Scaffold this active site. Structure first.
Site, short mmCIF file in Angstrom:
data_model
loop_
_atom_site.label_atom_id
_atom_site.label_comp_id
_atom_site.label_asym_id
_atom_site.label_seq_id
_atom_site.Cartn_x
_atom_site.Cartn_y
_atom_site.Cartn_z
CB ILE A 162 17.54 -15.14 8.53
CG1 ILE A 162 16.66 -16.14 8.19
CG2 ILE A 162 17.01 -14.36 9.86
CD1 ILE A 162 16.63 -17.45 9.31
CB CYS A 163 18.56 -9.52 7.98
SG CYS A 163 19.83 -8.44 7.03
#
Ligand SMILES: *P(=O)(O)OC[C@H]1O[C@@H](n2cnc3c(N)ncnc32)[C@H](O)[C@@H]1O
Lengths: 76, 985, 147
Positions: free
Chosen positions: C83-84
């Site tokens: 996940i960014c």
């Protein structure tokens, strides 16, 4: 009142604080001017390490006082 | 031409020009006692051109208090002649000589002159000459627990680097018509008023890219001002600014002029009235010695103290000092005049050696000019210190006895210490302990532990290890060296080769830790520090922590039931970049090095490990299918590195290297530029590849180019090492084989019920069965520095440089790549000496058993700017539990091995608290929200049985206690914080 | 870290997150399995996304390692589930609860950010052909995030 904070790397920071400010306010100001979270700041005045929850007047910090901002190192 | 294999850590601190200037400088050292020998050792390890010693005084036994190159068989021989032989071995590039007679005109051969153990008249005579002839002059004194340093580098000293920091740089977002430079979003420039910067890559104002420095007026943490740029343009966008550091002219005064009106450096702001006292006291010491044939006041003698104070009054009157003399402090200086402590010698030698390096290299800000220091808080108060107990006994500890006495010597000689780590600080600590006489009594003992072995880059800052000791264990060599220094330690030192961690608790258990007196850390990582701190807190042992970084250092002390532990405070964490930046849009060399390290891990160590583990685990696929997020990657990796691409020769290895080059430096860039063309605009209409995002460019292979060929060689060699082939470095074969490669065509793709599961199953069953291969293993490539010479650093350098050329970043050479990827910590011998001195000054406080928190000092220092700070330790916090005062760190519950129900009822009945959560190790033993059936199953079990059941692992036979963490809430429902529980098995 | 983890778990228990439900695995405190329901006003409507959370030994002084476990077609989430999020790499501070992380992830699902993407292919599809992105997201959520 105006105080100076000297880092362990020679940088100088000028803060505008009152004698009744808490150490938390001073740490927040140092964070604003430096980006160092208050929990990672180690301030020293006249051989005493300033602790959260107290006021400047407790440590007899007056105008033109010099604090030192230090940190621990991991080599050895 | 500097030997980077030995000065690797020191080059990260000083540089190349600095050490080039250093290796052309001559240092003369007058006096060869503990302070002189410490200075000479640090200078020799630093790497000056040569060192000359002058000390024709015959050796005396008391000199062995801090002189560790003297032995009892050298009594009656001049100190220089016996010390030169030992000093010559420290560094082979630094000749060490001896002069039997000194003349004034002879001083012109030396770049720096250091003076110790010399009267004030001789110092004036020498300085009157060195000042007018422009020679740096340093004078150092060590009297008991007092020390003084004086520096005079000439009337026109030129300092090229003042603070020693790396030049600042940053990325701009806009420069208005009036020079108001603004940084990027939430980015701090870090500059300060009066600084100089130079710009590059500024669009709209090309003139600023010339490189002329301009004054900076900081107007805020995010913006600053450079002046008026009306003529140069209207407004500028983007660009990068870099700081410019300018020389400074420092003017010093001679000793004769400086005595009248000195300029002090304050090592502690808590005592700002003392240095003026010490200024008079040291001159009075010199006068007293001149009046008694060079005899200093006897230890704890009152007649001599009175005469010394009369001299102090006379000197103060003569110099018109308007200072009221503190009689107690000055007489304390008098009493300890003949003291000679190895800790003070180490501290002052480190400081003075740093000053010598400043004089020779013209870097960092020198002391200007007087530096008076004292550690008078270390004087014992629990023993008898009088003229009777401080008189010399004709032994090698006379110097220490003159300050502490014989009873404190007996206390020191029966210590049982434990030293974790035997690196640089470890060697310094062992030397200090050997000189002080630690553990030489019938009940003393020293324990050293270190799991590493001696290398070539460790000898420079570790002076107990010689090139003939390469390959041995650090602890054994250190113990043997210090037993040679002090023969009384033969049989009193035990050395282990165990890493101190959770897996070595069978050796350093309850029995080992009950007998200790204190623990000293000499580590280089924080995890081990935290572990040792937790062990000390549990066993209630004093701990001495110390760390260094280049020219900076700190020391801290942990005292049971008095101060907070080491882990009660936080330190800045290591920077970790966003995955989006590392993977796609790097803009710094650190990003590319991190990407290259990840590529190495995923290309030479992840696939090999997966293949090897697949052939051994029979149920790996069962868990992999449902657990791992992307089992497809694992299956493809196993296939590719087992069957599809199994090499046999080296030509195919070079072909694979070329394939990977195309994969990672030519094709991914094309795909990225297909997805985000160079002329694309963001959702707001602004250009995409502007600012932090640099537009990449595919790299076309060129064998002649150095970087591409280096990458090919490194990758091919690493692959061969993976598959155990005979690698080659002859360029002819590489040129022959690379010319016959036709890259497969590549064109970017635009993309465009349980089939996937069936596909994965078909791929899985397609692999050979586990029984097909038995005993077949492949060697993953590990990371080191030429220890496994598989071009690790060279491969990472080539990958990072190629990716930098992809994004037009400035590449870095192998030195910086090794520094960054290896996570090397810059190291200095002087910082190590200073921290060891401070730690040994705190050790005597610990031995004396001081109970007040104002008597201990945590120390911080930076030698590049001459900054020293000391602060009292933070007292451990208190809390209220059941209306009782409880320490939050050093208090625990001691209970027998009782059933869970009995423990809960005990907490409900004695502490009036309701237990809500109870965990041990990493397991949740009990929680209030668990279903009734589970608890009813787990209630009548003992704590040991419960832990064994939950962790599915029997307790070891050597385990004698359990530590439980308990969270309980009061009757009213307010959660209460309570100390941990110590179950006795 | 055990006390901090248990305090956060209890805080979650006292006030239900409604749209999220995180809890340990077995009797281990350093490994949680969280669940998220896609926003109603989003292509991920009617989907259940599972996340794995690994608390480091230094928690809360080091960020938790949060990875998606289901397959989601999102610009800022890659095939490995990474996940960014800024608060998980370098903006983490020892004052953020897992509830804040789950709220941040739900907000991320609410509106993707193609200006600084982690998967350039999906970002390009989102910037060029919005309808195709919507259809692909719906198909992925109905093929992997339902059941
Ligand atoms: P500096 O890097 O010069 O030397 C550090 C020394 O500390 C030892 N060391 C590091 N970490 C540990 C642990 N966990 N246990 C025992 N010793 C340790 C290194 O081996 C160096 O000697």
């Amino acid at each position: 009142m105006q105080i100076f904070v000297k880092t362990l790397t020679g940088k100088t920071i000028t803060l505008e604080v009152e004698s009744s400010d808490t150490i938390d306010n001073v740490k927040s100001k140092i964070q604003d001017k430096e980006g160092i979270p208050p929990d990672q700041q180690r301030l020293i005045f006249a051989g005493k390490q300033l602790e959260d929850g107290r006021t400047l007047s407790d440590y007899n910090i007056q105008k033109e006082s010099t604090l030192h901002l230090v940190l621990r190192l991991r080599g050895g | 031409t500097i030997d980077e294999g030995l000065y690797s850590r020191q080059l990260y601190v000083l540089g190349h020009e600095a050490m080039k200037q250093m290796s052309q400088s001559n240092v003369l050292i007058i006096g060869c006692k503990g302070l002189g020998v410490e200075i000479a050792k640090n200078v020799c390890l630093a790497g000056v051109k040569s060192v000359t010693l002058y000390d024709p005084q015959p050796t005396r036994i008391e000199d062995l208090s801090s002189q560790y190159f003297l032995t009892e068989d050298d009594i009656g021989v001049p100190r220089a002649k016996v010390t030169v032989s030992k000093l010559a071995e420290l560094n082979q590039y630094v000749p060490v000589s001896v002069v039997d007679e000194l003349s004034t005109e002879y001083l012109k051969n030396f770049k720096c002159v250091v003076v110790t153990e010399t009267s004030l008249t001789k110092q004036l005579e020498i300085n009157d000459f060195t000042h007018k002839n422009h020679i740096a002059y340093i004078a150092a004194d060590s009297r008991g627990l007092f020390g003084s340093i004086f520096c005079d580098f000439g009337e026109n000293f030129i300092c090229t680097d003042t603070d020693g920091n790396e030049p600042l740089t940053g990325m701009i977002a806009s420069i208005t018509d009036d020079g108001v430079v603004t940084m990027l979003e939430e980015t701090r420039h870090g500059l300060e008023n009066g600084d100089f910067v130079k710009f590059t890559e500024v669009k709209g104002m090309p003139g600023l890219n010339d490189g002329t420095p301009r004054k900076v007026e900081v107007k805020g943490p995010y913006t600053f001002s450079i002046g008026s740029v009306k003529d140069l343009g209207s407004a500028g966008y983007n660009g990068v600014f870099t700081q410019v550091k300018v020389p400074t002219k420092i003017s010093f005064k001679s000793l004769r002029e400086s005595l009248k009106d000195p300029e002090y450096v304050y090592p502690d702001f808590g005592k700002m009235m003392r240095p003026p006292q010490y200024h008079i006291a040291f001159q009075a010491l010199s006068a007293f010695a001149d009046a008694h044939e060079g005899s200093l006041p006897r230890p704890r003698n009152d007649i001599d103290a009175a005469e010394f104070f009369e001299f102090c009054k006379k000197i103060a009157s003569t110099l018109q000092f308007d200072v009221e003399l503190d009689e107690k402090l000055i007489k304390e200086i008098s009493y300890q005049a003949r003291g000679d402590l190895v800790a003070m010698s180490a501290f002052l030698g480190g400081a003075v050696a740093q000053e010598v390096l400043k004089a020779t290299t013209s870097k960092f800000y020198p002391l200007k000019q007087y530096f008076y220091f004292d550690s008078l808080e270390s004087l014992p108060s629990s023993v008898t210190i009088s003229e009777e107990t401080c008189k010399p006994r004709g032994c090698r500890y006379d110097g220490q006895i003159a300050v502490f006495g014989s009873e404190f010597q007996e206390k020191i000689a029966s210590l049982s210490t434990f030293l974790v780590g035997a690196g640089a600080i470890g060697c310094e600590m062992l030397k200090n302990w050997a000189m002080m006489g630690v553990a030489t009594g019938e009940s003393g003992h020293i324990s050293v532990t270190d799991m590493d072995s001696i290398e070539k880059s460790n000898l420079n800052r570790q002076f107990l290890f010689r090139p003939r000791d390469v390959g041995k264990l650090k602890s054994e060599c250190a113990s043997t060296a210090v037993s040679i220094m002090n023969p009384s330690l033969t049989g009193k030192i035990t050395s282990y080769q165990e890493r101190v961690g959770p897996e070595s608790e069978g050796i350093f258990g309850d029995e080992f830790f009950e007998k200790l007196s204190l623990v000293t850390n000499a580590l280089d990582n924080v995890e081990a520090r935290m572990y040792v701190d937790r062990r000390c807190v549990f066993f209630e042992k004093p701990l001495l922590e110390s760390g260094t970084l280049g020219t900076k250092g700190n020391t801290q002390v942990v005292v049971p039931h008095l101060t907070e532990s080491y882990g009660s405070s936080q330190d800045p964490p290591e920077k970790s970049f966003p995955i989006c930046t590392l993977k796609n849009f790097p803009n710094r060399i650190e990003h590319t090095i991190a990407w290259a390290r990840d590529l190495f891990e995923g290309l030479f160590k992840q696939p090999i490990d997966n293949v090897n583990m697949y052939l051994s685990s029979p149920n790996f696929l069962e868990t992999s299918l449902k657990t791992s997020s992307n089992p497809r990657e694992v299956l493809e990796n196993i296939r590719d590195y087992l069957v599809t691409e199994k090499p046999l020769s080296f030509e195919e290895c070079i072909m694979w290297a070329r394939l990977q080059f195309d994969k990672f430096f030519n094709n991914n860039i094309q795909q990225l530029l297909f997805n985000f063309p160079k002329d694309s605009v963001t959702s707001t209409g602004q250009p995409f590849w502007s600012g932090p995002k640099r537009a990449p460019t595919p790299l076309s292979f060129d064998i002649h180019n150095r970087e591409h060929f280096d990458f090919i060689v490194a990758a091919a060699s690493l692959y061969a090492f993976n598959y155990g082939l005979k690698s080659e470095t002859d360029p002819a074969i590489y040129e022959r084989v690379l010319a016959g490669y036709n890259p497969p065509p590549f064109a970017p793709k635009s993309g465009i019920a349980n089939k996937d599961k069936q596909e994965l199953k078909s791929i899985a069953d397609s692999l050979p069965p586990p029984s097909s291969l038995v005993g077949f293993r492949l060697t993953p490539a590990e990371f080191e520095k030429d220890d496994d010479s598989n071009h690790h650093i060279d491969f990472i350098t080539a990958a990072s440089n190629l990716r930098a050329m992809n994004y037009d970043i400035t590449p870095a050479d192998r030195f910086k790549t090794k520094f960054v990827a290896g996570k090397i910590v810059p190291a200095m011998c002087t910082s190590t000496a200073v921290v060891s001195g401070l730690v040994c000054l705190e050790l005597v406080k610990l031995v004396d058993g001081k109970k007040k928190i104002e008597e201990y000092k945590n120390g911080f220092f930076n030698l590049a700017i001459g900054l020293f700070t000391f602060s009292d330790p933070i007292a451990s916090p208190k809390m209220k539990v059941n209306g009782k005062e409880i320490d939050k760190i050093w208090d625990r519950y001691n209970l027998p091995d009782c059933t869970l129900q009995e423990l809960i009822d005990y907490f409900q009945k004695e502490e009036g608290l309701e237990v809500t959560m109870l965990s041990s190790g990493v397991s949740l033993l009990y929680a209030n929200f668990q279903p009734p059936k589970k608890l009813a199953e787990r209630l009548p079990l003992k704590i040991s049985e419960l832990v064994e059941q939950i962790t599915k692992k029997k307790l070891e036979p050597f385990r004698k206690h359990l530590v439980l963490e308990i969270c309980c809430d009061d009757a009213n429902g307010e959660d209460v914080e309570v100390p941990f529980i110590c179950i006795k098995l | 870290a055990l006390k901090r983890i248990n305090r956060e778990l209890a805080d979650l228990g006292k006030d239900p997150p409604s749209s999220s439900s995180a809890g340990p695995v077995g009797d281990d405190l350093f490994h949680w399995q969280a669940t998220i329901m896609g926003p109603a006003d989003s292509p991920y409507a009617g989907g259940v996304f599972f996340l794995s959370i690994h608390f480091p030994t230094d928690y809360p002084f080091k960020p938790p390692k949060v990875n998606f476990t289901t397959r989601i077609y999102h610009p800022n989430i890659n095939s490995n589930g990474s996940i960014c999020l800024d608060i998980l790499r370098d903006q983490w501070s020892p004052a953020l609860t897992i509830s804040k992380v789950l709220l941040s992830i739900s907000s991320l699902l609410t509106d993707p950010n193609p200006d600084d993407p982690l998967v350039p292919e999906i970002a390009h599809v989102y910037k060029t052909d919005r309808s195709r992105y919507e259809l692909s997201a719906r198909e992925w959520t109905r093929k992997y995030a339902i059941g």
